[PDB]
Amino acid sequence: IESIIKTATDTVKSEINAELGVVPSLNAVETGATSNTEPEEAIQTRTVINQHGVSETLVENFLSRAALVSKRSFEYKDHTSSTARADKNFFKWTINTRSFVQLRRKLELFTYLRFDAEITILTTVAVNGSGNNTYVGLPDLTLQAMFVPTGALTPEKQDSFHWQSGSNASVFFKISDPPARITIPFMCINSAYSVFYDGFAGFEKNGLYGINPADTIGNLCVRIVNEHQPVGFTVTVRVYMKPKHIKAWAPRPPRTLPYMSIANANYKGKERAPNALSAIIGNRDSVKTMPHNIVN
Amino acid sequence: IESIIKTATDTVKSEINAELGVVPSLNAVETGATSNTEPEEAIQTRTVINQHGVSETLVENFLSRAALVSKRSFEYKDHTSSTARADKNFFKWTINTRSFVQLRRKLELFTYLRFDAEITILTTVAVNGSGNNTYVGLPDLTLQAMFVPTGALTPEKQDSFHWQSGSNASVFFKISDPPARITIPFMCINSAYSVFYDGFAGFEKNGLYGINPADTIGNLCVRIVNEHQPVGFTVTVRVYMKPKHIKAWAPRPPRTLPYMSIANANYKGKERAPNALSAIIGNRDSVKTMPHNIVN
Amino acid sequence: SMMEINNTESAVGMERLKVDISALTDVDQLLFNIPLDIQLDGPLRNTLVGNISRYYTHWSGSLEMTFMFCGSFMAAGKLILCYTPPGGSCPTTRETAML
Amino acid sequence: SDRVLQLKLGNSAIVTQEAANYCCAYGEWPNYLPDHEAVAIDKPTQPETATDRFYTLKSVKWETGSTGWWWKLPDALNNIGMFGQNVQHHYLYRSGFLIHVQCNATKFHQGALLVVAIPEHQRGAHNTNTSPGFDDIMKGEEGGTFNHPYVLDDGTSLACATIFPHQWINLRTNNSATIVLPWMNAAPMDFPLRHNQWTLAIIPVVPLGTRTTSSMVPITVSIAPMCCEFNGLRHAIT
Amino acid sequence: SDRVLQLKLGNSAIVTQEAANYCCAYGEWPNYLPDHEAVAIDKPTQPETATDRFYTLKSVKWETGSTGWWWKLPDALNNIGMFGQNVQHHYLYRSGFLIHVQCNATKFHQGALLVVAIPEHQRGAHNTNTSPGFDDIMKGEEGGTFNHPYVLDDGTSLACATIFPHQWINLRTNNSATIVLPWMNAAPMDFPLRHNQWTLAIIPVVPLGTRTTSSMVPITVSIAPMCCEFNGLRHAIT
Amino acid sequence: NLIVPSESSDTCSLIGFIAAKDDFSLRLMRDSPDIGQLDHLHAAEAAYQ
Amino acid sequence: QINFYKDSYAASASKQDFSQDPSKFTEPVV
Amino acid sequence: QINFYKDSYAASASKQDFSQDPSKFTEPVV
Ligand SMILES: Cc1cc(CCCOc2c(C)cc(-c3noc(C(F)(F)F)n3)cc2C)on1
Ligand SMILES: Cc1cc(CCCOc2c(C)cc(-c3noc(C(F)(F)F)n3)cc2C)on1
């Protein structure tokens, strides 16, 4: 029965039942169907006109909430003597949604998802305290965020030609400005994203497992447009993503064990319960014990 | 056949073909026409209702994207002892679209272009570190960008009378403000710009080759309205141009060799392939070798 | 537009834009193959379709590959041109390629 | 008995005298790809009776320390009959599956089986950062066993696995389970050799027990491909 | 040229620019078995594009002492592609054949080929009372050569072989021959591994000759099964 | 085989072309990796003099 | 709400889909 | 969209021209 549900269903009054051949409270779990027993059939009920709305559990409302997807700190300074491992006034991030547990677990409640993303970038700056540096003050810098799709070259320096962005989508924003905000469409080459992928990425046997090639996004390169200054600073960029226009398919069991990696669904659990490999739920003394027993 | 195309064409189912006098797969490249063979005529196909849009390849979408056209850094300081070669708190730029490769190559895919330009100016400032200067902080300066058409006099100082701009179009903007933005119309004395010009500019034999006089724009003079201060700064101004209301004629082969100059189409290529003068595409072992062969 | 099928050393300039075929003394012989990777450097890279497509990330649709024979009027031959959907290795024999 | 059912599917057939019902995953039936959802313009091959038929896999022994078994589709059916030949000779396929799990015992036997079809059951490893390898995932007709059926081998819970299309084999009640799975995928077709749409898992939630003479109690699995299509014909690749 | 023709038949295709016509054996076209002529009550499998497509055989060198070549059908196509897989997995088949023979030379070359499809070309041996053996008859994709093309290898005459569906490849005139053979048999279907309905013979009635530079002149054969049906599905038997 | 007479060149040539059909479609515009820039082009700075 | 943008995916969340079919998970039997 | 400017060239990009004639480059013969 497909219908429009805006409120919880009402209750109807019921009377004494004693009829042969009818056993509403008896079910068959083996069929794979949930019990269809009604409260009106198990107890004697009254008429209740239920006015509880159900708009808060809509998948759109459930998932349309900005969540931290990226957070990166780098030093904005003179990087002449820095090693070839630090972010020299810029960084690149391979976009993914598996780095922060809250959004990952919310998204992984479904097998397939189709949505547009709303990207918000929030930048903070702090004055470096290394050595004998003082507060000085916080400069108002300009940052450039460029989206490099798959196959496009990514910048290697803070002043490389790639930043001219002839066709790549870039956003220039100040720290004193509100957080930058854009919208990315549903970029999948399929009709929906694959939250879980029971396959391998390549045509050979050495490809990655569990990552769908169709769901590849690209890179987000963030640089400071300003040239360095006599004193060093630490710039932290946070990227939040909000799904919208969502369609969800095949809900899944929630994850109980802590996440181990962003590349796979590997599990080891906690040392003791709750959420341990051998005991998800915390233990009680026996099946005849309740911990929070009201005693008076 | 001129028509309205919003999606890719659909496929029709086809059956076995064996008919004398009909050879759809046979063509004549010498006529100068592309093969008209259809997939329905080469293989047995099925009916596919194609729903792929084609709005992303529209010339307007393809070219309506802001790209860096100018980038200039100059010292904002006391210029009493500076030589007559540095930008003394101002600069002038002869407008052109051949200085940065991405926009140049995108524009040079057509012989004629007609569009309005959207100009965005983004300014950043840094504290000079020369000598023993400290961070101090970043001042909020006012910049003036004046467009001087051909034949008009350009400023020679940061405080010359030319800056009063009785008739010249000027824009005054702060660094703390959003990037300045204006629109320039289609300024050509012809119906379209000449991306390529197989001619000489003057009536004598010593004129420039490949630059159309009809496409001359003028100069963009950018100054700091503020007077200098006790400490020096470095101001970088970036100018981005976005074509709009575009009309394109006579598409051209894309450039393969790296650009050598903004004044001409001179070429030398890379030392080795790819994109070398003698080998545009990288070499393989033989015509019977594929590099990325799937082996299992 | 022309494919650079002869993208091999010892081919210089225009020589890379044509494939030379001679008379063989064995049957069913392979003449050449074309890597279908536009997104990577290969014969299809410097084509109108390839050049314009390398400005985008996603592509769909069908392609046509035309071959013009440029011998003399009274040179004869028969060739077989084969496209193999992905999944395995490139066929090296006519029996496997005809499938 | 509790219910009777017959499943023809080609030149094969199955009769069950002690069944509960059969499950249609999400209340849907397999169907061929329509023209308004097609992608590949090649004319497909629809073998029908040659491929749409029950294939029976090797049986597994139902012991006391059994943790459960899983078979990935179409990986399990690849290399089996005309369906396997069509998979090997084609680049894309598309098919639903009618799954019948068989297990019988005596009336002095107790035990409960959860038979669940997990869509896109991407597995995880235990106590390691490395991802599962090709040999860990691709087991063929033999399938695999559950390392930790408690978490479904992916860090989730077995208790919530009833959200997926499932049935039970309760020895006290029935001896067979039937699930009808339509085509489940984000794409209209797919390469059969690198991705599994479904995983059939049989998990011993209630262990087998009896106090009469012990006998071998096996579990048999029969999968019938349904509405099979194939595109991209070329040489066999296996 | 003299005539142009294109033959699609599935995901394959052939173009000929120098042809005469094409021959339909006895003026008939391949068709599927009707219900009023069916015998086996099993539902048949009709792969269509998977099996109804051109398969090209190995080429044979056109020399001066060449006596001729023959290929028996479906024996030659058995073990080739999905048609071979369907033949191996099924007990009965039924199919017509579109045969295209290719041979080109220069305008200084002379030679005449008779390309004839003999129905039920039961062969005989020479100078012996023993009948031809299994290995003498079953040659597979490679085919065989004519011991005595004068008598067709059966005690008849090559001069009267034009009574069968045939064409000529006259180098002076054309470089290809096409014959469309319907299902020829006394039974509606047949076992593919023990009986050949057709034999394609290419015989050099006029030998190859030229006075210019010599080159290898091969002859290629492509057979497209048409309206293939298969009954009696079981394990592969090859 | 390729059969030619004695007065014809024994090596012939093929030219290959590729094109897209009406089925073709592209999306997700990016920067082409076929053009780059390591420094300023010649005469580019003269535009400021 | 306002959506002066030319692309339809730039609009805000569409929280007005109140249709549902729980029986596809609760009674997926015949 | 809005374009409260008095000059028409100040408007935004006009991405609604879906007419095309590829045959002027693919079949420029008679
Ligand atoms: C599941 C699932 C969800 C998604 C969507 C994530 C979108 O990722 C981004 C992010 C985080 C930022 C940008 C971005 N940042 O800046 C810019 C711009 F300024 F260049 F426009 N674009 C683009 C994408 C696609 O993909 N798979
Ligand atoms: C091809 C081709 C493309 C073009 C158009 C380029 C437009 O150039 C400019 C630029 C970059 C900036 C200004 C400008 N900067 O500031 C001002 C104002 F503030 F004074 F209004 N105008 C004016 C023009 C014509 O010309 N030929």
Q: Which domains, and CATH codes, for chain E?
A: 5-233 (2.60.120.20)
Given in angstroms, what resolution was this structure solved at?
2.7
Q: E2 CB contacts (<8 Å, ≥6 apart)?
A: E18, E19, E20, E173, E174
Method: cryo-EM
Residue D59's nearest CA partner among D218, D174, D202 is D218
Q: D154 in helix, strand or coil?
A: coil
- C-alpha distances (whole Å) from D224 to each of B189, D142, E88 are 74, 17, 21
Q: Which helix (H) or strand (E) holds A20?
A: none
Give residue ranges of F with CB < 8 Å to any C CB.
1-5, 8-34
The structure tokens listed for B213 are: 């006089």
Burial class (CB in 10 A: 0-12, 13-18, 19+), H11: middle
Range of the domain at A224: 1-296
Q: In the numeric block, which tokens belong to residue A114?
A: 């189709």
Q: What is the DSSP letter of A179?
A: P
Token pair belonging to E90: 């099924």
Q: How far apart are the first and last CA of chain H?
A: 43
E strand or H helix at A3: strand A3-4
Peptide bond into D74 cis (omega under 30): yes
Which of helix, strand or coil describes residue B117? strand
Instruction: Report yes or no: B165 and B139 within 8 Å, Cβ to Cβ.
Output: no
- What residues of chain B, 201 to 240, have a C-beta less than 8 Å from chain A? 234, 236, 238
For residue B43, list chain E residues with Cβ-Cβ distance below 8 A.
8, 10-13
Tell me whether chains F and C touch (3+ CB pairs under 8 A): yes
**Chains A, F: CB contacts under 8 A, how many?**
26
Q: Which residues on A lie below 8 Å from D120 (Cβ)?
A: 111, 194-198, 250
CA distances from B102 to A90, B211, B251 (A): 21, 19, 17
Residue with tokens 């080795």: B272
Who contacts D32 (Cβ-Cβ below 8 Å, separation ≥6)? D46, D227, D229
Contact: G19, A5; criterion CB under 8 Å = yes
Number of neighbours of residue C54 by Cβ within 10 angstroms: 23
Tally of domains within chain B:
1
What part of C 9-68 touches A (C-beta under 8 Å)? 39, 54-55, 57-58
Tokens of D30: 């397999």
Q: Is the CB of A145 under 6 A from ligand 1?
A: yes
- Are residues E105 and F3, on separate chains, in Cβ contact within 8 Å? yes
Q: Which H or E element spans position B127?
A: strand B110-127
Taking the Cβ of residue A28 and every Cβ of chain G, the question of whether any pair is shorter than 8 Å is answered with no
Nearest CA to E77 among E30, E134, E136, E140?
Answer: E140
Choose the residue to mutate in A63, A64, A68, A95 for probing ligand 1, maximizing ligand atoms within 8 Å of C-beta.
A95
Closest to A32 (Cα-Cα) out of D48, B168, B228, D165 = D165
Nearest C-alpha neighbor of A89 from the set A33, A34, A158: A158
Radius of gyration of chain F (CA): 24
Place of tokens 């008995």: D1
Closest CA to E76 of E29, E137, E32: E137
Q: D119 preceded by cis ω (within 30°)?
A: no
Cα dist from A200 to A193, D12, D192, E16, E221, whole Å: 15, 33, 11, 44, 41
Q: Name E164's Cβ contacts closer than 8 Å, sequence gap at least 6.
A: E116, E117, E118, E119
By Cβ distance, the residue of B5, B36, B244 closest to H18 is B5
Strands (DSSP E) found in chain D:
5-7, 14-16, 23-24, 55-56, 60-61, 69-73, 92-102, 110-119, 144-145, 166-170, 176-181, 198-209, 218-231
- Cα of G17 to nearest chain D Cα, Å: 20
> Measured between alpha carbons, how far is G8 from D132 in angstroms, rounded to an integer?
41
Looking at chain F, which runs of residues are DSSP E strands? 12-20, 25-29
Distance from CA of E82 to the nearest CA of F (A): 28
C-alpha A17/C-alpha A38 separation (Å) is 13
The pairing of beta strand D69-73 with beta strand B67-76: unpaired
User: Residues with beta carbon inside 6 Å of ligand 2?
Assistant: B 69, 95, 97, 117, 119, 145-147, 169-171, 182, 184, 193, 215, 217, 220, 239, 241
Tokens 């349904």 belong to which residue? D226
Which two structure tokens, joined as six digits, stand for C69?
A: 């024979």
Residues of A in contact with F31 (CB under 8 A): 148, 152-153, 162, 165-168
Diameter of chain B measured on Cα atoms:
91
From atom 5 of ligand 1, which residue's Cα is the shortest distance away?
A: A117
**Which among E126, E113, E127, E196 has a CA at the least distance from the CA of E158?**
E113
Look at the alpha carbons of B261, B264, B266, B270 in this order and tell me if their dihedral is positive or negative. positive
CA of B117 to the centre of ligand 2 (A): 7
CA pair distance F37, A162, nearest whole angstrom: 8
Nearest to D63 by CA among D221, D222, D174, D204: D204
Chain A: closest CA distance from residue G7 (Å): 9
